[PDB]
Point group: C2
Chain length 178, copies 2
Amino acid sequence: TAEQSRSLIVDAAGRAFATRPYREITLKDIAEDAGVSAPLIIKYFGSKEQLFDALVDFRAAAEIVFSGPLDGLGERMVSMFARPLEPYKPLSLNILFMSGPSEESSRKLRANYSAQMIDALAERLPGRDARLRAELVMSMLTGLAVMRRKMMQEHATGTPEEVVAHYAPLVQELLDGG
Amino acid sequence: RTAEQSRSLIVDAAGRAFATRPYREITLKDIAEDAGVSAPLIIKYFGSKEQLFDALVDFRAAAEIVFSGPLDGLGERMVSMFARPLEPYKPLSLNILFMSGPSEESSRKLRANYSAQMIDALAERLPGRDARLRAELVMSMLTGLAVMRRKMMQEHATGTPEEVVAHYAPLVQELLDGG
Ligand SMILES: [Mg+2]
Ligand SMILES: [Mg+2]
Ligand SMILES: [Mg+2]
């Protein structure tokens, strides 16, 4: 029912917002990609703007990325960001890149990312400069995914475990503090 | 002023345009308007829109700047450059890439150039095993930092550049030294 359709819609909307300029996207485009009709996107989400708001609520992402103890969190996060996924993931940064002169959509995304992603990590870190360190962790993780998935693509060297071996201890140093 | 200074204005305006709007939505007229020069002047110095684009995505000068000097202390020097609070569309490498899309010719040439001129150029310098991977990870860290601070965070980026160096440069230096 809603479950299978909504997931198809969210999936299509994320792709759309992460790959095309905000100002170009219609609900009809999203519906066509989702294999649904536009009216039931309006039923479940109300408007394009509200659909966008759902896609820039980062609370679920933070629940996935920061799950579990700080011990070994570096390696768990790098594993996830080292997976060779689509060039438009993570959605956070890719939707941001597609904003352009859509200033309100960019503003909402950035405010939510700071509160729901960065601060969610910063709250958990021991020691001094927790906020700065959380920004640096997300710099490393998002920078890795964008570099590998978008800039390098097939040119990317090394397997995910090799990425983890080199990069996770560095992420873990930021998590641990000092 | 001089030819050299007209060229500087054009390159500045062209980089901004290509890093902020889709390739297809960019005209030499608009670049000229932003630069404060005439479009025929852009043609004199660069030949065409495509050739201007090719100049922008030639990363050899960027590599000379970013990888200059001994490997000793290079991490700190590199984090110092990428920690500066520059425009949200810099670095041009990534921002112009974001404006390209579905492995268009523009995108293919940009990526090939970045791989050879940036990644491989750094990798050739590194001691120890897995040099290409380590160069990719260094650039991941540096570009990730600048995009996060300049584009995502903006006014709410935390810390001065020296504070960023203190935490981040030793990590960059570990990858340079051996991984
Ligand atoms: Mg993210
Ligand atoms: Mg770069
Ligand atoms: Mg070597």
